[PDB]
CSV table of C-alpha atoms in Angstrom, one decimal:
chain,number,residue,atom,x,y,z
R,1,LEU,CA,25.6,39.8,83.8
R,2,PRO,CA,26.1,36.5,85.4
R,3,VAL,CA,23.0,35.0,87.3
R,4,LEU,CA,22.9,34.4,91.0
R,5,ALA,CA,20.7,32.0,92.9
R,6,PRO,CA,20.7,31.0,96.6
R,7,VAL,CA,21.4,27.4,97.3
R,8,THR,CA,19.5,25.3,100.0
R,9,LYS,CA,20.5,22.0,101.3
R,10,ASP,CA,17.4,20.0,101.8
R,11,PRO,CA,17.3,18.5,105.4
R,12,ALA,CA,15.4,15.3,104.6
R,13,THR,CA,17.4,14.3,101.3
R,14,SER,CA,20.7,16.2,101.7
R,15,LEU,CA,20.3,17.3,98.1
R,16,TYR,CA,21.0,20.8,97.1
R,17,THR,CA,18.3,23.1,95.4
R,18,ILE,CA,17.9,26.6,93.7
R,19,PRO,CA,14.7,28.5,93.1
R,20,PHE,CA,13.6,27.9,89.5
R,21,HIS,CA,10.3,29.9,89.2
R,22,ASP,CA,7.1,30.3,91.0
R,23,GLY,CA,8.2,28.8,94.4
R,24,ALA,CA,9.4,25.6,92.7
R,25,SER,CA,13.0,24.7,93.0
R,26,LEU,CA,15.3,22.3,91.0
R,27,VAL,CA,17.9,19.9,92.4
R,28,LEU,CA,21.5,20.8,91.4
R,29,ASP,CA,23.1,17.8,89.6
R,30,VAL,CA,26.6,18.5,88.5
R,31,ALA,CA,26.7,15.3,86.5
R,32,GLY,CA,23.3,15.9,84.9
R,33,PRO,CA,23.1,17.0,81.1
R,34,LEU,CA,19.6,18.4,81.1
R,35,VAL,CA,17.3,21.0,82.9
R,36,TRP,CA,14.0,19.2,83.4
R,37,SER,CA,11.0,19.8,85.4
R,38,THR,CA,7.2,19.0,85.6
R,39,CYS,CA,5.2,21.4,83.5
R,40,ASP,CA,1.8,23.1,83.7
R,41,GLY,CA,-1.0,21.3,82.0
R,42,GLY,CA,-1.1,22.5,78.4
R,43,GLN,CA,2.5,23.9,78.4
R,44,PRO,CA,3.4,24.2,74.8
R,45,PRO,CA,6.3,22.0,73.6
R,46,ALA,CA,8.9,23.9,71.7
R,47,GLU,CA,9.0,23.5,67.9
R,48,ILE,CA,12.2,21.5,67.6
R,49,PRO,CA,12.6,18.8,65.0
R,50,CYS,CA,14.4,15.6,66.3
R,51,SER,CA,17.2,16.4,63.7
R,52,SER,CA,17.8,19.9,65.0
R,53,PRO,CA,21.1,20.8,66.5
R,54,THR,CA,19.2,21.6,69.8
R,55,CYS,CA,17.7,18.2,69.8
R,56,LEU,CA,21.0,16.6,69.3
R,57,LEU,CA,22.4,18.6,72.3
R,58,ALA,CA,19.3,17.3,74.3
R,59,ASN,CA,20.1,13.6,73.5
R,60,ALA,CA,24.0,13.8,73.4
R,61,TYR,CA,24.5,12.1,76.7
R,62,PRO,CA,21.8,9.2,77.0
R,63,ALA,CA,20.0,8.4,80.2
R,64,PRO,CA,20.7,5.0,81.6
R,65,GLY,CA,17.7,2.6,81.0
R,66,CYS,CA,16.0,4.7,78.3
R,67,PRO,CA,15.9,4.3,74.5
R,68,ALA,CA,16.8,7.4,72.5
R,69,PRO,CA,14.8,6.3,69.4
R,70,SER,CA,15.4,6.8,65.7
R,71,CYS,CA,15.9,10.1,64.1
R,78,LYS,CA,8.7,15.0,63.7
R,79,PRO,CA,9.2,16.7,67.2
R,80,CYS,CA,12.1,16.2,69.6
R,81,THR,CA,12.0,13.8,72.5
R,82,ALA,CA,14.6,14.0,75.4
R,83,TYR,CA,14.9,11.6,78.4
R,84,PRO,CA,15.1,13.3,81.8
R,85,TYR,CA,16.9,11.2,84.4
R,86,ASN,CA,16.4,11.2,88.2
R,87,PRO,CA,19.9,11.0,89.5
R,88,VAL,CA,18.8,9.7,92.9
R,89,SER,CA,16.4,6.8,92.0
R,90,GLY,CA,17.8,6.2,88.5
R,91,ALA,CA,14.5,6.5,86.8
R,92,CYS,CA,13.9,8.1,83.5
R,93,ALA,CA,11.1,9.0,81.1
R,94,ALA,CA,10.3,10.8,77.9
R,95,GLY,CA,9.7,14.5,77.9
R,96,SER,CA,9.2,17.1,75.4
R,97,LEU,CA,11.5,20.1,75.3
R,98,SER,CA,9.7,23.2,76.3
R,99,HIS,CA,10.6,27.0,76.7
R,100,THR,CA,10.5,28.0,80.4
R,101,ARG,CA,12.0,30.7,82.6
R,102,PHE,CA,14.7,30.6,85.3
R,103,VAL,CA,13.8,33.6,87.6
R,104,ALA,CA,16.8,34.8,89.7
R,105,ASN,CA,18.9,37.8,90.1
R,106,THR,CA,21.9,39.2,88.3
R,107,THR,CA,25.2,39.8,90.1
R,108,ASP,CA,28.3,41.8,89.6
R,109,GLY,CA,30.2,39.8,92.3
R,110,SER,CA,28.2,38.0,95.0
R,111,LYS,CA,25.1,40.4,95.7
R,112,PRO,CA,21.9,40.7,93.7
R,113,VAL,CA,21.8,43.6,91.2
R,114,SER,CA,18.5,43.2,89.2
R,115,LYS,CA,15.8,40.5,88.9
R,116,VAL,CA,16.4,38.5,85.7
R,117,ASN,CA,14.2,36.0,83.8
R,118,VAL,CA,16.4,33.8,81.7
R,119,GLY,CA,14.9,31.9,78.9
R,120,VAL,CA,15.9,28.2,79.0
R,121,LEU,CA,14.8,24.9,77.4
R,122,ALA,CA,13.8,22.3,79.8
R,123,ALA,CA,12.4,18.7,79.2
R,124,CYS,CA,8.9,18.5,80.6
R,125,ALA,CA,8.9,15.4,82.9
R,126,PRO,CA,6.0,13.2,84.4
R,127,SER,CA,5.1,13.7,88.0
R,128,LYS,CA,6.4,10.2,89.0
R,129,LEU,CA,10.1,11.2,88.2
R,130,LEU,CA,9.9,13.5,91.3
R,131,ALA,CA,10.1,10.6,93.6
R,132,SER,CA,13.2,10.7,95.9
R,133,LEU,CA,13.6,14.5,95.1
R,134,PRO,CA,13.2,17.2,97.7
R,135,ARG,CA,9.7,18.4,98.6
R,136,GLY,CA,8.8,21.5,96.7
R,137,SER,CA,11.4,20.5,93.9
R,138,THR,CA,9.9,20.1,90.5
R,139,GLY,CA,12.9,18.7,88.8
R,140,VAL,CA,16.7,18.9,88.2
R,141,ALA,CA,19.1,21.6,87.1
R,142,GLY,CA,21.9,19.7,85.3
R,143,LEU,CA,25.2,21.5,85.6
R,144,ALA,CA,27.2,19.0,83.6
R,145,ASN,CA,29.4,20.0,80.6
R,146,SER,CA,26.6,19.4,78.1
R,147,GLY,CA,24.9,21.9,75.6
R,148,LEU,CA,21.5,22.1,77.4
R,149,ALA,CA,22.7,21.9,80.8
R,150,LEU,CA,22.0,25.2,82.8
R,151,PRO,CA,25.3,26.8,82.8
R,152,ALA,CA,25.6,26.5,79.0
R,153,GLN,CA,22.1,27.9,78.6
R,154,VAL,CA,22.7,30.8,80.9
R,155,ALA,CA,25.9,31.5,78.9
R,156,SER,CA,24.0,31.8,75.6
R,157,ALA,CA,21.0,33.7,77.0
R,158,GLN,CA,23.0,36.2,78.9
R,159,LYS,CA,26.1,36.3,76.6
R,160,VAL,CA,28.3,35.3,79.6
R,161,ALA,CA,30.8,32.5,80.3
R,162,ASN,CA,30.0,28.7,80.2
R,163,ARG,CA,31.3,28.6,83.7
R,164,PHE,CA,29.6,28.4,87.1
R,165,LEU,CA,30.5,29.0,90.8
R,166,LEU,CA,29.2,26.9,93.8
R,167,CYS,CA,29.4,27.6,97.4
R,168,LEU,CA,27.4,24.7,98.9
R,169,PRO,CA,26.0,25.3,102.3
R,170,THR,CA,26.0,23.1,105.5
R,171,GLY,CA,23.0,25.1,106.4
R,172,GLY,CA,21.7,28.6,105.5
R,173,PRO,CA,21.6,29.8,101.8
R,174,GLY,CA,24.7,29.2,99.9
R,175,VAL,CA,25.5,30.5,96.4
R,176,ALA,CA,25.3,29.5,92.8
R,177,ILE,CA,26.5,31.9,90.1
R,178,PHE,CA,26.1,31.1,86.5
R,179,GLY,CA,28.3,32.9,84.0
R,180,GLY,CA,31.7,33.9,85.6
R,181,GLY,CA,33.3,37.2,86.3
R,182,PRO,CA,36.0,37.6,88.9
R,183,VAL,CA,35.7,35.1,91.6
R,184,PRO,CA,34.0,36.8,94.7
R,185,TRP,CA,35.1,36.9,98.3
R,186,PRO,CA,38.8,37.7,97.5
R,187,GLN,CA,39.5,37.8,101.2
R,188,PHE,CA,39.1,33.9,101.0
R,189,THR,CA,39.6,33.2,97.2
R,190,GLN,CA,42.5,35.6,96.1
R,191,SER,CA,44.9,32.5,95.9
R,192,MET,CA,42.5,30.0,94.9
R,193,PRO,CA,44.2,26.8,93.6
R,194,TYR,CA,43.1,25.3,90.3
R,195,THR,CA,43.3,21.9,88.8
R,196,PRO,CA,42.5,20.8,85.1
R,197,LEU,CA,38.9,19.7,84.3
R,198,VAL,CA,39.2,16.5,82.2
R,199,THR,CA,36.8,15.6,79.6
R,200,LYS,CA,36.0,12.0,79.3
R,201,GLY,CA,34.5,10.5,76.2
R,202,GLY,CA,30.8,9.7,76.4
R,203,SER,CA,30.3,11.5,79.7
R,204,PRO,CA,29.3,15.2,80.4
R,205,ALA,CA,30.6,15.0,84.0
R,206,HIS,CA,33.2,17.0,85.7
R,207,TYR,CA,36.4,15.1,86.3
R,208,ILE,CA,39.7,16.1,87.9
R,209,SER,CA,43.0,14.1,88.6
R,210,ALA,CA,44.3,13.1,92.1
R,211,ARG,CA,47.9,11.8,92.1
R,212,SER,CA,48.1,11.0,95.8
R,213,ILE,CA,46.0,10.4,98.8
R,214,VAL,CA,47.2,11.2,102.3
R,215,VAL,CA,45.8,10.5,105.7
R,216,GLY,CA,47.3,12.8,108.5
R,217,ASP,CA,50.8,13.0,107.2
R,218,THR,CA,51.2,9.6,105.7
R,219,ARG,CA,50.6,8.6,102.1
R,220,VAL,CA,48.0,5.9,101.5
R,221,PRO,CA,49.6,3.2,99.2
R,222,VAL,CA,47.5,2.3,96.3
R,223,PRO,CA,48.0,-0.2,93.5
R,224,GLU,CA,49.9,0.7,90.3
R,225,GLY,CA,47.9,3.1,88.0
R,226,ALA,CA,45.0,3.3,90.5
R,227,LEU,CA,45.1,7.1,90.5
R,228,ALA,CA,45.0,8.2,86.8
R,229,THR,CA,44.1,11.1,84.8
R,230,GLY,CA,40.4,12.2,85.3
R,231,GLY,CA,40.0,9.6,88.0
R,232,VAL,CA,38.0,11.9,90.3
R,233,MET,CA,34.5,12.8,89.5
R,234,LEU,CA,32.4,15.5,91.2
R,235,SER,CA,28.9,14.6,92.2
R,236,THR,CA,26.0,16.4,94.0
R,237,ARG,CA,23.9,13.2,94.1
R,238,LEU,CA,25.3,11.8,97.4
R,239,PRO,CA,26.6,13.5,100.5
R,240,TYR,CA,29.5,11.0,100.8
R,241,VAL,CA,32.5,9.9,98.7
R,242,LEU,CA,32.3,6.8,96.6
R,243,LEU,CA,35.6,4.8,96.3
R,244,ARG,CA,36.5,2.1,93.8
R,245,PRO,CA,37.7,-1.0,95.8
R,246,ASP,CA,41.5,-0.6,95.0
R,247,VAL,CA,41.3,2.9,96.8
R,248,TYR,CA,38.5,2.2,99.3
R,249,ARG,CA,40.4,-0.5,101.3
R,250,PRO,CA,43.7,1.2,101.9
R,251,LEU,CA,42.0,4.5,102.6
R,252,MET,CA,39.5,3.3,105.1
R,253,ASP,CA,42.2,1.2,106.8
R,254,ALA,CA,44.4,4.1,107.2
R,255,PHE,CA,41.6,6.4,108.4
R,256,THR,CA,40.4,3.9,111.0
R,257,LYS,CA,43.9,3.0,112.1
R,258,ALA,CA,44.9,6.7,112.6
R,259,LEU,CA,41.5,7.3,114.4
R,260,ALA,CA,42.1,4.5,116.9
R,261,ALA,CA,45.7,5.9,117.7
R,262,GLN,CA,44.3,9.3,118.7
R,270,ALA,CA,36.7,6.4,119.5
R,271,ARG,CA,34.2,3.7,119.8
R,272,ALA,CA,32.9,2.0,116.6
R,273,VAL,CA,29.3,1.0,116.4
R,274,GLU,CA,27.2,-1.1,114.1
R,275,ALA,CA,27.2,0.2,110.5
R,276,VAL,CA,24.2,2.1,109.2
R,277,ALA,CA,23.6,1.4,105.5
R,278,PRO,CA,24.9,2.5,103.2
R,279,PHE,CA,28.0,3.2,105.3
R,280,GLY,CA,30.7,0.6,106.2
R,281,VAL,CA,32.1,2.2,109.3
R,282,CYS,CA,30.3,4.2,112.0
R,283,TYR,CA,31.2,5.7,115.5
R,284,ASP,CA,29.4,6.7,118.6
R,285,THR,CA,29.5,10.5,118.6
R,286,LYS,CA,30.0,10.6,122.3
R,287,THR,CA,33.5,9.2,121.9
R,288,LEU,CA,34.5,11.6,119.1
R,289,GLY,CA,36.2,15.0,120.0
R,290,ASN,CA,35.6,18.2,118.2
R,291,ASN,CA,38.1,20.6,116.7
R,292,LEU,CA,37.9,23.6,114.3
R,293,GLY,CA,37.2,21.2,111.4
R,294,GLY,CA,34.4,19.3,113.0
R,295,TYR,CA,34.8,15.8,114.4
R,296,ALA,CA,38.4,15.3,115.6
R,297,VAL,CA,39.2,12.5,113.1
R,298,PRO,CA,42.3,12.2,110.7
R,299,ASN,CA,42.6,14.8,108.0
R,300,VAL,CA,42.4,13.4,104.5
R,301,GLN,CA,44.1,15.2,101.6
R,302,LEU,CA,43.8,14.6,97.8
R,303,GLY,CA,46.8,15.8,96.0
R,304,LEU,CA,45.6,17.1,92.6
R,305,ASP,CA,47.2,17.9,89.4
R,306,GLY,CA,48.6,21.5,89.6
R,307,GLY,CA,50.2,20.6,93.0
R,308,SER,CA,47.5,21.8,95.5
R,309,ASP,CA,45.6,19.6,97.9
R,310,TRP,CA,41.8,19.2,98.4
R,311,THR,CA,41.4,18.8,102.2
R,312,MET,CA,38.8,16.8,104.1
R,313,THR,CA,38.3,17.5,107.9
R,314,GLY,CA,35.6,15.9,110.1
R,315,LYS,CA,32.8,18.1,108.5
R,316,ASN,CA,33.7,16.5,105.2
R,317,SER,CA,34.7,12.9,106.2
R,318,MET,CA,32.0,12.2,108.7
R,319,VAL,CA,28.3,12.1,108.3
R,320,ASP,CA,25.7,12.5,111.1
R,321,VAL,CA,23.1,9.7,110.4
R,322,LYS,CA,21.1,9.8,113.6
R,323,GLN,CA,21.6,10.9,117.2
R,324,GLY,CA,24.5,9.0,118.8
R,325,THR,CA,26.0,7.8,115.4
R,326,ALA,CA,28.3,9.4,112.8
R,327,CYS,CA,29.6,7.4,109.9
R,328,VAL,CA,32.8,7.7,107.8
R,329,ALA,CA,31.8,9.3,104.4
R,330,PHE,CA,33.8,6.9,102.4
R,331,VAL,CA,31.6,4.2,100.8
R,332,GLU,CA,32.8,1.4,98.6
R,333,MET,CA,31.5,1.2,95.0
R,334,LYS,CA,29.6,-2.0,94.5
R,335,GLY,CA,28.5,-3.6,91.2
R,336,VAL,CA,29.5,-2.1,87.8
R,343,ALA,CA,35.2,3.9,86.3
R,344,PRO,CA,36.4,6.7,88.5
R,345,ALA,CA,38.7,5.9,91.5
R,346,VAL,CA,36.9,8.5,93.6
R,347,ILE,CA,33.5,10.3,93.4
R,348,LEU,CA,33.5,13.5,95.6
R,349,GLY,CA,30.0,14.3,97.0
R,350,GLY,CA,28.2,17.1,98.6
R,351,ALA,CA,29.7,17.3,102.0
R,352,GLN,CA,33.2,17.4,100.5
R,353,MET,CA,32.1,20.3,98.4
R,354,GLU,CA,30.3,22.2,101.4
R,355,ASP,CA,32.1,25.3,102.4
R,356,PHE,CA,34.6,25.3,99.4
R,357,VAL,CA,34.1,28.1,96.8
R,358,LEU,CA,34.2,26.1,93.5
R,359,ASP,CA,34.8,27.6,90.1
R,360,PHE,CA,33.8,25.2,87.3
R,361,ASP,CA,35.2,26.9,84.3
R,362,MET,CA,34.4,25.0,81.1
R,363,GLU,CA,36.1,27.6,78.9
R,364,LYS,CA,39.6,27.5,80.6
R,365,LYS,CA,38.8,23.9,81.4
R,366,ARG,CA,39.7,24.1,85.0
R,367,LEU,CA,38.3,23.8,88.5
R,368,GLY,CA,39.1,26.2,91.2
R,369,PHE,CA,38.7,25.2,94.8
R,370,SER,CA,38.9,27.4,97.8
R,371,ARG,CA,38.3,25.9,101.1
R,372,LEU,CA,36.7,28.5,103.4
R,373,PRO,CA,38.2,29.1,106.7
R,374,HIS,CA,36.8,27.5,109.8
R,375,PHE,CA,35.1,30.7,111.1
R,376,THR,CA,32.9,31.1,108.1
R,377,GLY,CA,31.1,29.0,105.5
R,378,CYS,CA,28.8,29.3,102.4
R,379,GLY,CA,25.6,29.6,104.3
R,380,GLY,CA,24.8,33.3,104.4
R,381,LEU,CA,27.9,34.3,102.4
């Protein structure tokens, strides 16, 4: 059966973790191609030649800043998605200890055999305390969903219900989408595979603030132009989309709030004493992404505003700087949606939960 693990949002880092084994957790990285962890001293490396199909899967999506040398055992290159650091590690057999589920509730304890790259302790910098590595949930052969699929003979497909607080849900292997009271009419949009990337991309055709379409330059919103990411809590926007979106949002907010000095990395922040509250969180303009398939991904205050410190909340849209997707949706835009990442039907289901519930404790 599919494998269920509870999801915790780390208060200090805002990253999301699942229990892995023995009190240790892994960070969920939906753009990450590998499962990697520190390993006990003397942990045996798996007997995998570098020429092996399995090794090829391990190095199919190279880590930025690391070699991938010439192919005699297999070396993979675990990548910390927060700090950007990488290092060599040997693949090794390990266990993902969780429960099976026939829907949303645990049935039996299960120990799933998976291959993980054994990383050095220094790669844990910037990860949550108690985390020992990363659970890559990208569309790659040695990502966690693909490995559960092979071990349990279930689907290369996973469900996320990321929490704002309390234990959310991750289910690896499909089955009918749970909570039909909320998900019976779940919209779907295609997952777009991009060459050279294992990440999950979808396509937005329009952006709307309140009821007014945000004008963007010609071709700005293109097939596969929206990436999903659990590395940051906020949205990253390419400059052609950033400016018109932020202008529309701040103008609409000013027509309904007192701006304050920006807190890095954010561009626009407000004094929370001057923000109202409605069912969706802070009373700020609704933002809708019109996706392929005709349904909208909606952002309310809980999605578009981040509490950074007492007295200040910042708009969760941050301009990309430096070196490409128009939009990278982050954690707080995924929170309290049931998301069905289906790499077999090549689609993403996205059910926004009603205001009176949420993923935590679901």
